[PDB]
Design a protein around this ligand. Structure first.
Ligand SMILES: Nc1ncnc2c1ncn2[C@@H]1O[C@H](COP(=O)(O)OP(=O)(O)OP(=O)(O)O)[C@@H](O)[C@H]1O
Ligand SMILES: [Mg+2]
Length: 280
């Protein structure tokens, strides 16, 4: 097997790896690396080319194409360089120093994020999702772990990552889809309906929900109850959980967490919701 991207020797000569491990999947690892010429921090995502006996190089090439297509979009992480060795393709990505937006969804940071902050972050996410949709790209993995922040103090800007699930609209629901963290799946996935831009809008409702209440809207005692809640769209909107959340935000969330994907507004409409029309 011949290599397509720059040799590993070039990587070791231009970049420095640190002990800082930013993320570890089963066939991917994200390490912090630093340029030797500029000392600028980057994120090096190592992707194994073989997964479960299957040669997945073509799948990696797809994720690179999508990163390239959205380079002009500030809300999508930028791809700086690509390297390759025997078993890995290495993506050098713009470093997001703020980390996952999932941190803001936990009760221990609820006291530093206000409604005004959530409005800005949701507006930025919608901007990036609007771009992807305009290019017939559906992320299909818009969970808080795949949406990062440029900085945390002060709260920075949105950077969407992880395009391994990206597809053209209308693709067929494959096993890879209906096998993610159950609580972030859309009802149409469990039904095996085809892929639609509306699937990403469902996840945007979860993001907004978790940022404002700091709880998951669909997780249950076990996976079975999680699936039941998703298909039944059983979401807690009680006064206890929403005593401090505005009605406009409640309306925004409820318009996106609807079973029928047809009834969900598009990314362009969401940007016109009264809740986001805040004269910052
Ligand atoms: N550019 C980056 N800057 C900072 N942290 C990053 C960056 N890219 C990824 N991470 C972190 O690494 C973690 C894993 O990265 P990523 O989500 O892109 O791949 P993965 O989900 O683990 O694997 P796969 O794409 O094969 O499903 C992310 O949750 C995020 O916290
Ligand atoms: Mg991920």
């Amino acid at each position: 097997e011949n290599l397509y991207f720059q040799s590993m020797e070039n990587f070791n000569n231009f970049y420095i790896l640190t002990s800082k491990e930013l993320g570890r999947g089963k066939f991917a690892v994200v390490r912090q690396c630093i340029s030797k010429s500029t000392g600028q921090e980057y994120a090096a995502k190592f992707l194994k080319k073989r997964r479960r006996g299957q040669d997945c190089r073509a799948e990696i090439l797809h994720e690179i194409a999508v990163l390239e297509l959205a380079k002009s979009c500030p809300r999508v992480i930028n791809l700086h360089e690509v390297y390759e060795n025997t078993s890995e393709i290495i993506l050098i990505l713009e470093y997001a120093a703020g980390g996952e937006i999932f941190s803001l969804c936990l009760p221990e940071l609820a006291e530093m994020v206000s409604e005004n902050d959530v409005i800005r972050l949701i507006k930025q996410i919608l901007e990036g999702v609007y771009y992807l949709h305009q290019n017939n790209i559906v992320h299909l993995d818009l969970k808080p772990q795949n949406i990062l922040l440029s900085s945390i103090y002060p709260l920075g800007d949105i950077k969407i990552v992880d395009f391994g699930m990206s597809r053209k609209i209308g693709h067929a629901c494959e096993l890879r889809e209906i096998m993610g963290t159950p609580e972030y799946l859309a009802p149409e996935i469990l039904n095996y309906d085809p892929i639609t831009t509306a699937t990403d809008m469902w996840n945007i409702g979860i993001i907004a929900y978790m940022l404002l209440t700091h709880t998951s809207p669909f997780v249950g005692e076990d996976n079975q109850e999680t699936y039941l809640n998703i298909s039944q769209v059983n979401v807690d909107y009680s006064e206890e959980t929403f005593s401090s959340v505005s009605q406009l935000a409640t309306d925004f969330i409820q318009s996106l967490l609807v079973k029928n994907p047809e009834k969900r507004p598009t990314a362009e409409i969401c940007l016109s919701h009264s809740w986001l029309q805040q004269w910052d």
